[PDB]
Design a protein around this nucleic acid. Structure first.
Ligand code: AI3
Length: 565
DNA sequence: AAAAAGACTT
DNA sequence: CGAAAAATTTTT
DNA sequence: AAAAATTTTTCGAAGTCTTTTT
């Protein structure tokens, strides 16, 4: 089509659409039972299970490979939830989990998977084709004059929850989502989608102030899950753009706030002193303002405002630095945040005051929570909140570091390295860690062997040139002195090759325990990127793949080479 | 308020 | 997402 | 061709902030 929505006038705040029509959500493929020969054993005696329970048994049989299926919490929860999905001959016989034998089911599944990567184009293409009849019928919805794409219209299948980290609910069954759980949201003038035969949707609402197409209540933590639009849409873009534009507004008066909190580290009231120290951490250390959460329903992890006392430790002078805080805690997605950080004299003397006669299990910031912090932030700048501090620090660091890295002289894949090194700088700030792929890091030897090979191809292009400079001394004609210029051009064509290969070796190494994923799509103004690519002639696709190009299709078209965040 | 939902964001 | 799978692509 | 290191998809939750209810 080619729809420039960024040129259109905005929508009067709070009203999100006028028209919304979609063929609804796609359900999970119905459960296909086990064939006779894949028997299940309880107490060593052959037991055949009812479809409800057998379904729940496969979920466990498939995860057997994992170390977590031995964890107490996991076996406790799972089993409690399996008993429930069992009949009475079964709730009588199957007393504990530990006496059931899934090994046969488990092996059948490892077989089906290996005997899937073995079908030829005769059966393989027939699936990739049937899937395309689907993405077309259910994957696009019409929202106000335009056919826009839906994110993940395919509803999540029932399995067992595991979640990240030490989740208290790990093991609990994720119930299959029936149409009687689904609320559809469309316009009054839209052709309301038809439910699967023999079912009704939970509600057909026309709430035009929301951007969601379908919503149901999932049951592990009782949170409301949704089916929203593709990031390439208007309803997701206007928004993302607003967010970077709000990140830019914070820049105009960032120094002003960094002056007031610097002075607020004095204040007569203790409660203002907290709200200021917290603000420093979020600013200079890019911390998620930690909202509090229900104990026993989430993995114990925290952010800034929820920082318990046991999570921070003081040190006056360590490893040569003056006035340091030894940060150690589990942040979002249970990823660790270890950092020895040198603060200002006041702040250190201010943290001591916050820990003074307090128990390890208690809050560092008493009578402070994210609500209070955001209330202040909102007074400071219209529309401000605490994530903007991570978006700004992320963006302003990508742009300023591209200026400090990208050299005019350098070739095209070297710019990519200078860029990736800037991207990296954000990821270390934002604590966007990654764990090096499971024993797949011997592929550093099989990328370095390609280099200690290209060094030999070029070793000899020089040794071949050194013969031509001993032949251009005795006999200096049109077919000698010009045969050197084609043997030096050959050293050059292989230099620019070895260089690309070696630049792509340190871009892989420095990035072994760092994830640039999140910062690329979620933090970082894409215009900062487009500006740079238009400026140094690096073709856009060398930085952004297709879904990233699609999401960022508003920036690509808009920003000039001169754009400055 | 201030818990508890809901709706976005990462 | 980003680690894990499926679909590819290079290496052997 | 067949193993081997890839590049692309699929999968499986946890945050922030805002708006409601009790
Ligand atoms: C960092 O950025 C993103 C991080 C994510 C992390 N986890 C999940 C999603 C994400 C989407 C992001 O950006 C768009 C979508 C999602 C769906 C799920 C789920 C986990 C996640 O468990 C069941 O269904």
């Amino acid at each position: 089509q080619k729809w420039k929505w960024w040129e259109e006038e905005r929508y009067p705040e709070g009203i999100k659409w006028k028209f919304l029509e979609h063929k609804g959500p796609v359900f999970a493929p119905p459960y296909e039972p086990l064939p006779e020969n894949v028997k299940f054993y309880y107490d060593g005696k052959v037991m055949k299970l009812s479809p409800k329970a057998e379904e729940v048994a496969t979920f466990f049989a498939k995860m057997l490979d994992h170390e977590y299926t031995t964890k107490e919490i996991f076996r406790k929860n799972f089993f409690k939830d399996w008993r429930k999905e069992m009949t009475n001959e079964e709730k009588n016989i199957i007393t504990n989990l530990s006496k059931c034998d899934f090994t046969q089911m488990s092996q059948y599944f490892k077989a089906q998977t290996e005997a899937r990567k073995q079908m030829s184009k005769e059966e393989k293409l027939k699936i990739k084709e049937e899937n395309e009849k689907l993405l077309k019928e259910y994957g696009f919805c019409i929202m106000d004059n335009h056919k826009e794409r839906i994110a993940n219209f395919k509803i999540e299948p029932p399995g067992l929850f595991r979640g990240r980290g030490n989740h208290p609910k790990m093991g609990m069954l994720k119930r299959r989502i029936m149409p009687e759980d689904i609320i559809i949201n469309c316009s009054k003038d839209a052709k309301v989608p038809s439910p699967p035969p023999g079912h009704k949707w939970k509600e057909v609402r026309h709430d035009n102030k929301v951007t969601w197409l379908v919503s149901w209540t999932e049951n592990i933590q009782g949170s409301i899950k949704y089916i929203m639009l593709n990031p390439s849409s208007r309803i997701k873009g206007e928004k993302d753009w607003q967010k970077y534009e709000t990140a830019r507004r914070l820049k105009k008066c960032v120094d002003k706030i960094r002056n007031q909190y610097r002075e607020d580290w004095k204040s007569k009231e203790m409660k203002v002193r907290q709200r200021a120290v917290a603000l420093y951490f979020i600013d200079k250390l890019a911390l998620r303002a930690g909202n509090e959460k229900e104990e026993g329903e989430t993995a114990d992890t925290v952010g800034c405002c929820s920082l318990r006392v046991e999570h921070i430790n003081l040190h006056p002078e360590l490893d040569g630095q003056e006035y340091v805080v030894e940060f150690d805690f589990l942040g979002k997605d249970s990823i660790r945040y270890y950092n020895k950080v040198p603060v200002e004299k006041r702040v250190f003397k201010n943290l001591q005051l916050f820990m003074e006669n307090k128990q390890p299990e208690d809050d560092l910031f008493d009578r402070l929570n994210t609500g209070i912090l955001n209330k202040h932030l909102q007074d400071l700048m219209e529309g401000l909140t605490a994530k903007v501090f991570r978006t700004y620090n992320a963006s302003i660091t990508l742009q300023q570091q591209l200026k400090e890295l990208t050299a005019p002289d350098e070739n095209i894949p070297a710019k990519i390295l200078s860029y990736n090194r800037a991207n990296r700088a954000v990821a270390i700030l934002c604590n966007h860690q990654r764990a090096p792929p499971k024993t797949f890091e011997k592929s550093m030897m099989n990328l370095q062997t390609k280099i200690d090979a290209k060094k030999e191809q070029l070793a000899d292009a020089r040794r071949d040139l050194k013969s031509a400079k001993a032949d251009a001394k005795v006999m200096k004609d049109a077919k000698t002195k010009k045969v050197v210029e084609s043997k030096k051009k050959a050293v050059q064509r292989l230099e620019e090759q070895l260089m690309k290969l070696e630049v792509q070796a340190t871009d892989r190494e420095e990035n072994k325990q760092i994830a640039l994923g999140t910062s690329k799509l979620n933090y970082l103004d894409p215009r900062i990127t487009v500006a740079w690519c238009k400026k140094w002639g690096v073709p856009i696709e060398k930085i952004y793949n297709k879904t990233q190009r699609e999401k960022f299709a508003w920036a690509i078209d808009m920003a000039d080479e001169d754009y400055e965040f």
